Design a protein around this ligand. Structure first.
Ligand SMILES: Nc1ncnc2c1ncn2[C@@H]1O[C@H](COP(=O)(O)OP(=O)(O)OP(=O)(O)O)[C@@H](O)[C@H]1O
Ligand SMILES: Nc1ncnc2c1ncn2[C@@H]1O[C@H](COP(=O)(O)OP(=O)(O)OP(=O)(O)O)[C@@H](O)[C@H]1O
Ligand SMILES: [Mn+2]
Ligand SMILES: [Mn+2]
Ligand SMILES: [Mn+2]
Ligand SMILES: [Mn+2]
Ligand SMILES: [Zn+2]
Ligand SMILES: [Zn+2]
Lengths: 340, 356
DNA sequence: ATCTGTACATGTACAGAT
DNA sequence: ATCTGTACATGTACAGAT
DNA sequence: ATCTGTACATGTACAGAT
DNA sequence: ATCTGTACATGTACAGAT
């Protein structure tokens, strides 16, 4: 009852989706065309849409869109950075940039910013660079505000790096044939010290969000609806509302929630453990899983098992205890935060 | 248990598989390479292994392989032959290495098959390290069949096929009803794969005889056989074993044994049995209706179903709903009744034909 | 010199063998 | 249970062609 | 190489039926 | 309340034309 009503509030409106999408598509098409057909270092960059809007787990409003501009590279040589699992040096047009990530991002960002100056028909600016973040972020102002993250990424077509050998443990859930095929796809590197890139599996996570049942018919027109995505949306909402209220939660992001629920989906593969009539206890067992991650300070990258997203190197113990207390409070009081 | 022991007799032996597959691949690789030579009209033909051996339902011995030599054919327009749903005339838009077989835009199937056969016969002649010959042509067969004496006898059907990448012919819009079983995403992807036309090659005396092609979906059936569960992990190393393929084997065997004994059953073929079970798998989508512990009553329900198809004279092509493989036009009532009595007899007497 | 159809190289599900 | 041969999907090398 | 056309997936929206 | 059926909307894969 309660959680149904929250999900109705979170649902995007069809009209709001139509307006944001056609503005976003205008800017993205024009930027993609400024690459390639202008003999840049990024000729041949191809588009791939990623993230919550395209996985259909976006909540509240269509106000944030993620796009990769992926660029195939002749067979590069990778070297793992100091055993971090997820970060790598890259070695061997592009000779203008060891393939320095910051050097290549800056030219990328220099092109985007120039093309945005010549957009006289949409209110669109380029957000001040956030260091380390791999994105070039656009603030579009429809009558409403929309973020777009243009993520530069190298596409490599060989075996996945060995730090992922034990990753993606879908064998008992989506199965071995799905896993083998997923791992036959390319992998991607995005910018993160100034020469380091980071692995990306946004394409693999997109497939999983839209192929998320042990049953091939899960959530199709001739199958049964499950509540996996609704739990992702609810857990996403709880963290969004808590990040607004508390600056102490600045080090948490939605990817932390995404990763935890990939683990829950793997720990509980059956589609009937995610029946829509059991939406409450499903969401509760996700809260308890997420609190177990905080207490043990352990949340492994789903594709890179040794990379702990909750290591003290990245998040202070106090931040996790703070979030642990705030989540425990919303849990034991009917989620008052969902009504504001 | 009794059915468990039949499957062990039906189980292929890896030693036999190894020697059969070594010879068969040597011959096919050499025929395929010959097709790419000179001004051969079949340049660019590609190989696609189909049928029971590659679905892992081949029984008793590895002694019959099917392989498709498919040739992609671009601007192609199709005329359904007399509302049959499965048979087509193939016409060409622009007036081409295949022009040698045209007859005013209409592409002759038996002209193409003859040139295919002649080339195959010639390459078989120059194979000196293997005892292989080319079977006398069989009417209604799209295939050029090789007999190998590897000491043991081995049949190989080289099937000539046209490959069209366009959307499937509308006679199939209602076919492949896998929405409640393998689902709609699977169905949409499957129907984005090409479709194939093989020569009908009948000598019936009917009009358009040598210019009639038949639709083929061996490629879609290979996928289904090897991805047969509602659950993605069905029969995988971290999932539950089902008995779907084991039922198909037991039924294939019932028909093979009876066909071996009774000339009356010449009109029947293993595809009837494959088709019947695709309907049974659609009817019973859940993996739990194909539990290994209920192999007996699973095999029994597929029998009851096959009997109803023989008696009511209705077994729809899985992909072309309006094509009835058991119409009276194709098989006599007398032939269907005879098989119905024989299946009944085995069913209610402990299957004594398994012990032969 | 580069290009490219052909064939080797790699990895793993499937199921037979032990 | 683990070891293992065949089939097949996709990446990559390179002899011969340009 | 680039771009449109097509089909049907994933959604939202709502009335009528349960 | 939910379930079913139809309208409406965008996203995505790829054939075929240029
Ligand atoms: N720390 C990270 N490590 C790896 N991939 C990440 C990380 N952060 C983001 N991504 C990838 O980028 C995508 C876009 O991330 P973003 O921050 O927009 O969140 P999201 O999943 O799209 O959801 P939302 O925007 O609604 O919070 C993610 O879905 C994920 O694939
Ligand atoms: N009458 C038919 N109509 C349509 N497709 C057919 C027909 N006969 C055969 N096929 C196709 O050709 C394939 C090869 O036929 P074949 O007679 O070898 O049987 P099979 O399914 O391979 O089994 P087995 O040879 O072990 O009896 C079949 O799997 C099917 O895809
Ligand atoms: Mn997003
Ligand atoms: Mn983002
Ligand atoms: Mn066969
Ligand atoms: Mn055959
Ligand atoms: Zn679902
Ligand atoms: Zn199975």
């Amino acid at each position: 009852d309660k959680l149904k009503k929250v999900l109705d509030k979170l649902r995007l409106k069809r009209k709001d989706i139509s307006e944001a999408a056609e503005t976003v598509n205008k800017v993205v098409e024009r930027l993609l065309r400024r690459m390639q057909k202008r003999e840049s270092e990024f000729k041949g960059v191809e588009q791939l849409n990623t993230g919550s809007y395209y996985e259909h787990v976006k909540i509240s409003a269509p106000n944030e869109f993620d796009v990769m501009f992926k660029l195939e590279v002749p067979r590069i040589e990778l070297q793992e950075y100091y055993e971090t699992g997820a970060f790598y040096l890259v070695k061997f047009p592009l000779s203008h940039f060891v393939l320095s990530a910051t050097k290549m991002l800056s030219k990328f960002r220099k092109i985007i910013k120039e093309e945005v100056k010549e957009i006289k028909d949409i209110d669109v600016s380029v957000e001040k660079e956030k260091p380390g973040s791999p994105a070039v972020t656009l603030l579009i102002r429809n009558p409403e505000e929309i973020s777009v993250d243009i993520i530069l990424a190298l596409e490599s077509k060989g075996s996945w790096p060995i730090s992922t050998k034990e990753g993606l443990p879908i064998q008992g859930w989506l199965g071995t044939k799905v896993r083998t095929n997923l791992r036959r796809e390319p992998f991607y590197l995005v910018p993160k010290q100034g020469e380091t890139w980071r692995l990306s599996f946004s394409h693999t996570e997109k497939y999983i969000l839209n192929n998320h049942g042990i049953e091939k018919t899960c959530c199709e027109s001739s199958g049964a609806k499950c509540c996996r995505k609704e739990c992702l949306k609810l857990m996403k909402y709880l963290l969004e509302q808590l990040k607004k209220e508390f600056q102490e939660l600045d080090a948490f992001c939605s990817y932390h929630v995404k990763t935890a629920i990939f683990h829950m989906w793997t720990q509980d593969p059956q589609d009937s453990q995610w029946d829509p009539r059991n939406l409450s206890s499903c969401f509760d067992k996700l809260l308890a899983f997420f609190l177990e991650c905080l207490r043990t300070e352990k949340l492994d990258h789903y594709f890179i098992p040794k990379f702990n997203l909750f290591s003290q190197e990245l998040i202070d113990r106090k931040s996790k205890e703070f979030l642990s207390k705030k989540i425990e409070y919303e849990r034991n009081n009917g989620f008052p935060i969902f009504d504001k």
